[PDB]
Amino acid sequence: GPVGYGAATTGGGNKVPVNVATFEAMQSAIDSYSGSGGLVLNYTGKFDFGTIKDVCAQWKLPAKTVQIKNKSDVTIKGANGSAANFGIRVVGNAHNVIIQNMTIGLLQGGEDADSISLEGNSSGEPSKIWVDHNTVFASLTKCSGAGDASFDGGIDMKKGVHHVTVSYNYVYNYQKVALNGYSDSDTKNSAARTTYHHNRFENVESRVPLQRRGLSHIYNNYFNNVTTSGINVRMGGIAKIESNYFENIKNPVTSRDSSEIGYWDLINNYVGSGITWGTPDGSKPYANATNWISTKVFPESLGYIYTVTPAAQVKAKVIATAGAGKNLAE
User: Fold this and answer.
1) Residue 212: how many CB atoms within 10 A of its CB?
2) What DSSP line would sit under 64-108, residue for residue?
3) Which residues are catalytic?
4) What domains does the chain contain, in order, with CATH numbers?
5) Helices (H), the chain
6) What are phi and psi of 81, to 5 degrees?
7) What residue ranges in 159-230 does DSSP mark as E strands?
8) Cα–Cα distance, 232 to 251 (Å, whole number)
């Protein structure tokens, strides 16, 4: 099962899976569901990404997104070899959700092209969410006319989604990997408690993650070819950054672009070759972990048991286990 802040997550448990071949069938099954007690959706669709001939056609088309809204006790799992050209939102008073083994790529909608998005609102905030062994990709291409938004977020949460494990995911060819707190005014995000572990982040730009407020544990992740910034801790947030493998990454551990800085507790990180650093434009305060020195001690017990892969073994371990179609290997 899940390790970390989302450890209690069971999703739809042992309920007999409902096979769903399209995002419409998936949505219909969610809509018919009573909202609690358990629902397991086995997604069997096999989207052919070769059908997308132009990676800049996507942003101007409307988003295709499945919604779990105010419903609990749900597993969404991709069958092996399954592929989705739609995204998933979990919104409001929605709890105990597993999203697993999904391959999600090249989504329509641009700024609206959410891959996996977890969202608090006036009705409540999601909790006990396990985002595990998914493969999420797009393009680094900046399309003509698109603004900064040819695609959008990879694995995102905001407005005080709490108690979440984001584990063994593979996110590549992706500009904005992981949002955690949508703006400096997202005060509900002080509640966020997120464990990011054993994720593969390769050929990506930034937000790996972007953390605003709350507490995080970012351990045993492999970072390679991250071109703008990596872990960006902001607005008083504190990240415990433990036994990750970093290589070919600019600004691996930083705080920038918020009105107030965030902090890190660094230990046992493998720092490989190709680390670069840069200074942000603007007058907002910033910090670069140039010497890998902690700026705050993690202020409380993590309240869970976890086992650490030796940092030097992380690259190989994560390459071996991260993403969809891996039999959920750990």
Assistant:
1) 27
2) -EEEEES--SEEEEEPTT-BBSSEEEEESS-EEEEEES-EEES-S
3) 207
4) 1-330 (2.160.20.10)
5) 23-32, 314-321
6) 80, -5
7) 162-167, 170-176, 179-180, 193-197, 200-206, 210-212, 215-219, 222-226
8) 9
